Design a protein around this ligand. Structure first.
Ligand SMILES: Cc1cc2nc3c(=O)[nH]c(=O)nc-3n(C[C@@H](O)[C@H](O)[C@H](O)COP(=O)(O)OP(=O)(O)OC[C@H]3O[C@H](n4cnc5c(N)ncnc54)[C@@H](O)[C@H]3O)c2cc1C
Ligand SMILES: Cc1cc2nc3c(=O)[nH]c(=O)nc-3n(C[C@@H](O)[C@H](O)[C@H](O)COP(=O)(O)OP(=O)(O)OC[C@H]3O[C@H](n4cnc5c(N)ncnc54)[C@@H](O)[C@H]3O)c2cc1C
Lengths: 489, 482
C-alpha cells in the first residue's frame, strides 16, 4: 500500500530512493533528524563510485565542486601515493565532495524523481508479514503505521531496523579511539600541517581541524574540548587548544562489524546499517552508494514483477563479500599506521618501497578506489563463464556511424539493462526482441579485452552475460530468462 | 700476520680465506669444546653459491638440505618460491651450525692456520704498524703481535669493546625462549607454529619455542613452562631430561664502523638481530669472504687502503637491511588478532604475486645483494654477482665460473672476443685471464673483471678501451709488474 519504505535520509538512503524511482517504483524515505547534518565525515568519492554516478548523469552535478587527487595516499605513506593512472578508467580521480553537499544533491534528485522525503520521522518498531511489511513511525503530528511491500534499512550504524529484524552482524570490539573536530586558529600562529606519527599515538593538526588516534583505548559521557587537549598527549607542545569557538567535534572507534545477512525475508540493509569500520581511506560512503545502486534496480524489478527471488538474493551474495574486504583493509591499514617505531616503521619502509612497484601500487589502488570489484553470479556448470561476466562495463565507449564517441555510461541512465552488439551479431538481437525492459544498442568497440561480441549489461554497469563467437542464441535466451524473468506473449 | 678472535663459523671461514689468499692466519677461540647445539642453522642461496666458489659446497651436501624454500613470517600458504630467482642453486642448505663449524674448522686446519681452542682475549693495543692482543691460555697469559686483528667472536665481542665502537641499535622488547625437550607429557599434541593472543608458540616432538612481545639470571625449565602462558593446555613441560635451552632478544645493534685502523669486525661482532628467517650466519660468512681476499691482499702488498675501506662500505649497508627486515618481520608476526591478522591476509595475497614473492625471496636469501664501489656512468654489471655463470668454448663443455674462483684469484672473462683487453692484463699476478663464451651477458657484456668473492669489479661493453681497464686494474689490485 506504499511500495517500498527506506529508513534513513542518509546518502545511501537518498541514493536508494532515486534508483527505486528510476526503476519505476514508489519510494518513501523516513529520516529521523529534521535538519540534515553532515559537517564532520567530510567526504571523498573514488573512481568506481564516480564511474557509477556517471551511469546516472549525476556526475555532471558533482563536478561544480573541485574534486582532485590523482590520487593517493595510503596509510599515511605519502612519498609513494596511490597512482590512479595505472588503472583502466575514464575517470582517474576522486571527487572531493563534502558529505553534506553530497546529501544535498542526492536529496534534490530524489525529490524531483517523485519520492516522499518526510524529514523528522523516527521509526519505533516493525513487523514482517508474508506479503507486506509494517513500520511504526513517530511523526510530529504523532505516531502512525505504514505498510509497504519491502523495507530497506538505510539508517546509521546503530540501525534500529537491523535490531528489529534481528541480524548480527558480529564484528570486533573497538580498541582505537579517534577524536576529531574543527577549531581554526586558537593558540600558536603557524604550528605545522603534517600527519605525523609519534610514539603513543598519531596526531594530525592544521591552522594558518584536529584529529587524534590513540591505539589501546576501550561509563563515558559525550566528548568535550578539554577531552581533546589531553588526547593530544601524543604531542609534546600542549596546544589544548583552545577556544576558539567549538565546531562539531566527534569521536570514532575501530569496531569492525557487519550484518550476517543483507536480507531477512522482505527487510534489506544498506550502507552503514550493513557494515561498520574505522574511517580510514574514505571507503564508507563509497561502499554504501554502490550497495544502493546494486539493490535499487534489483528491488524495483522484484516489485514490478520481472525481478525474481533469486535475483534479489544476489544483492547480499555480491555486496557482502565486498564490505568484508573493506573492514579487513581498514584493519590492516591501521596495523600499518601503528604507532610503533621499533617494528612498524621498518615495515612501513619496505611497504613504501613496494608501493613504488606498479603491480603492487595498482593492487592497493584497486582495493581502495573500488575498481577491483567484480561479481560472480549465475555461473553455469558444466561450461566455464566468459571472461566478462561480473566485470564492470560502465566505462566503455562506442561508435559506429560517423565515428562519434558514445559512452555506455550515457545509455544506462535509462536504468534499463542493455545488449551491446559490438561486433555484428543479429541472431542475438532478434533473440532479444521480446523485451521490455532490456534494450539492444548496436555499435562497434574493439575492446573487448578479452574479446567479446555481445555484453548483456545490468543497470548498475556490471556485465551479466557475455558472448564469444560460439555463444548461440539459445544460450542467451536462458541467460535473459534467468536474469530478467520470462519473455512477452 | 693476522689474528682473528673467535672460533665461530665466521672466524673459521675468515681463517680459510686468509690462507687461501696466501697469508698466515691465527684463530684464538674462547671456549675449548665447541658448542653449537642450539641455533640449528640454514644456508641460503647466495651463501651456498658462495661456498661453491670455494669448493666447499660438495662437503656440505652430505647432509640433506632442502626447502625450495619458504616460509616467511609464519606465512605458510604462500611460501617464498626460490624458482623465481636466477640461480644455479635454488635451495637452502639445512646444515646444523654445529656441523657447519666442524667442516669450516677442518678446512682451516688443512689450510695451515693455527686453531688454539681455549684462549680468551683479555685486552688489546693498536700501534701504527702492528697490533698486540693479550691472551689467556691454559699455560698462562702471553702477548701476541700481528699486522691486523679481526673480531669474529660473539655479539658480546670484547674486541668491539676494546677498540671502542658503537654500534648503537635498539633495546630488546621481545623475549624468546627455546630448548630441546621430549617427550614431556602428552602423546598427541601438535606440530604447528600457531600465533595465539598474548604470544606465539611453536611446539614439537610426539623442540619448544616461545616468543613474548612486551618483555624487557640464567633461564630455567620452570621458566619455560610459564612462558607457555600463550597456550591454554599447560604442558610445562616437563622432565624429560633437559637439553641446551636458551633465551634470545630482539635487540638490533650494529657496529658504526667495521674498521678502526687495523682492527676489523665480522659476523655477530658487527651486527645483532632477532633470529628470524635464519639470516645471522649467512650474513656473517659473506662478511668473511668479502674481507678475506681484501685483507690478505693488503698484507701481501697489492691490497690498497682504499680497497680495505670498501669492506665496511659494502657490508654495513647489507646488515642494516637485515636488522630492518627482521624488525619488520616481527611486526608481521602478530600477536594482534585485531589489526595484524588482517594485514597478514593482504600480505599473504601479495606473496602470491611473483614480483613481490621474488622481492622478499631476494631479501632473505641474499640474492639481492649488489655492491656499488669505485664508480667513475658505470656498466650494468659493476657490483653484480657472477659466481653463478657457466662458460664453454671448446667442445661445448659446461665450465662453471664457480670452479675458477677457487684459486682465490681475480679473473678476467673474455666472453666475446677481445684480445686488446687480455694483452692489457699480461702484467699480473695475481689476476688470471680465462677465455670462454657466454651469451649472457644480460645485460650484454664482453668482459668481466671478477673479484675473488664472485662479484664483478669492472665490466666491459664494446666501447670499453684497454686504457679504461688499465686504470680499473691499477685501482682494484694495485700497480702492475716491472
Ligand atoms: C571522520 C570520518 C570521515 C569519513 N570520510 C569519507 C570519505 O572521504 N569518502 C567516503 O566515501 N566515506 C567517508 N566516511 C564514511 C561516512 O560518511 C559513512 O560511512 C556514510 O555516511 C554512511 O552512509 P549512510 O547513509 O548509510 O549513514 P548515515 O548518513 O549515518 O544515515 C543516517 C540516516 O538514517 C538515520 N537514522 C538512524 N536510525 C533511524 C531510524 N530508527 N529511523 C529513521 N532514520 C534513522 C538518520 O538519522 C539519518 O540522517 C567517513 C566517516 C567518518 C566518521
Ligand atoms: C636460536 C637461534 C637460531 C639461529 N638460526 C639461524 C639460521 O637458520 N640461519 C642463519 O644463517 N643464522 C642463524 N642464526 C644466527 C647465528 O647462527 C649467528 O649468526 C652465528 O652463530 C654467528 O657467527 P659468529 O661466529 O660470528 O658468532 P659465534 O658463533 O658466537 O662465535 C663466537 C666465538 O668467538 C667467542 N668469543 C667471545 N668472546 C671471545 C674472547 N674474548 N676471546 C676468544 N673468543 C671469544 C667464542 O665464544 C666463540 O665460540 C641463529 C641464532 C640463534 C640465537
Amino acid at each position: 500500500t506504499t511500495d517500498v519504505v527506506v529508513v534513513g535520509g542518509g546518502p545511501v538512503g537518498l541514493m536508494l530512493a532515486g534508483e527505486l524511482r528510476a526503476g519505476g517504483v514508489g519510494a518513501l524515505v523516513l529520516e529521523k533528524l529534521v535538519e540534515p547534518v553532515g559537517h564532520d565525515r567530510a567526504g571523498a568519492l573514488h573512481i568506481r563510485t564516480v564511474e557509477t554516478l556517471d551511469l546516472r548523469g549525476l556526475l555532471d552535478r558533482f563536478l561544480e565542486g573541485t574534486q582532485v587527487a590523482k590520487g593517493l595516499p595510503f596509510a599515511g605513506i605519502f612519498t609513494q601515493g596511490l597512482d590512479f593512472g595505472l588503472v583502466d578508467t575514464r575517470h582517474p580521480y576522486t571527487g572531493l565532495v563534502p558529505q553534506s553537499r553530497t546529501e544535498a544533491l542526492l536529496a534534490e534528485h530524489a525529490r524531483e524523481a517523485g519520492a516522499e522525503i518526510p524529514r523528522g520521522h523516527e521509526v519505533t518498531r516493525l513487523r514482517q508479514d508474508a506479503e507486506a511489511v509494517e513500520v511504526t513511525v513517530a511523526g510530529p503530528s504523532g505516531p502512525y503505521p505504514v505498510r509497504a511491500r519491502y523495507g530497506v534499512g538505510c539508517d546509521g550504524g546503530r540501525s534500529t531496523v537491523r535490531r528489529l529484524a534481528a541480524d548480527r552482524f558480529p564484528g570486533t570490539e573497538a580498541t582505537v579511539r579517534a577524536l576529531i573536530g574543527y577549531v581554526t586558529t586558537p593558540e600558536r600562529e603557524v604550528p605545522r600541517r603534517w600527519e605525523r606519527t609519534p610514539d603513543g599515538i598519531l596526531v594530525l593538526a592544521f591552522p594558518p581541524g584536529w584529529s587524534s588516534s590513540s591505539t589501546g583505548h576501550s561509563d563515558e559521557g559525550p566528548v568535550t574540548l578539554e577531552d581533546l587537549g589531553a588526547a593530544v598527549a601524543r604531542v609534546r607542545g600542549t596546544p589544548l587548544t583552545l577556544t576558539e569557538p567549538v565546531s562539531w567535534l566527534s569521536r570514532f572507534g575501530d569496531a569492525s562489524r557487519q550484518a550476517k545477512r543483507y536480507r531477512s525475508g522482505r527487510v534489506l540493509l544498506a550502507g552503514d546499517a550493513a557494515h561498520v569500520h574505522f574511517p580510514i581511506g574514505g571507503q564508507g560512503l563509497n561502499t554504501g552508494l554502490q550497495d544502493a545502486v546494486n539493490l535499487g534496480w534489483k528491488l524495483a524489478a522484484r516489485v514490478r514483477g520481472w525481478g525474481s527471488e533469486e535475483l534479489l538474493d544476489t544483492y547480499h551474495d555480491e555486496r557482502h563479500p565486498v564490505a568484508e574486504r573493506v573492514l579487513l583493509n581498514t584493519r590492516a591499514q591501521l596495523a600499518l599506521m601503528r604507532p610503533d617505531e621499533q617494528h612498524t616503521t621498518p615495515l612501513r619502509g619496505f611497504v613504501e618501497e613496494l608501493l613504488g612497484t606498479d603491480e603492487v601500487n595498482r593492487y592497493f589502488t584497486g582495493m581502495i578506489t573500488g575498481t577491483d570489484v567484480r561479481y560472480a553470479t549465475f555461473a553455469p556448470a558444466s561450461a566455464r563463464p566468459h571472461p566478462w561476466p561480473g566485470r564492470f562495463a560502465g566505462g566503455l565507449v562506442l561508435s559506429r556511424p560517423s565515428g562519434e564517441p558514445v559512452p555506455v555510461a550515457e545509455l544506462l541512465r535509462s536504468a534499463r539493462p542493455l545488449l551491446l552488439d559490438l561486433a555484428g551479431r543479429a541472431d542475438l538481437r532478434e533473440a532479444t526482441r521480446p523485451w521490455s525492459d532490456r534494450v539492444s544498442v548496436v555499435a562497434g568497440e574493439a575492446t573487448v579485452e578479452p574479446p567479446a561480441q555481445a555484453l548483456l549489461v545490468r543497470p548498475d554497469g556490471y556485465v551479466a552475460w557475455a558472448g564469444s563467437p560460439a555463444a548461440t542464441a539459445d544460450e542467451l535466451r536462458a541467460s535473459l530468462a534467468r536474469w530478467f524473468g520470462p519473455p512477452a506473449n
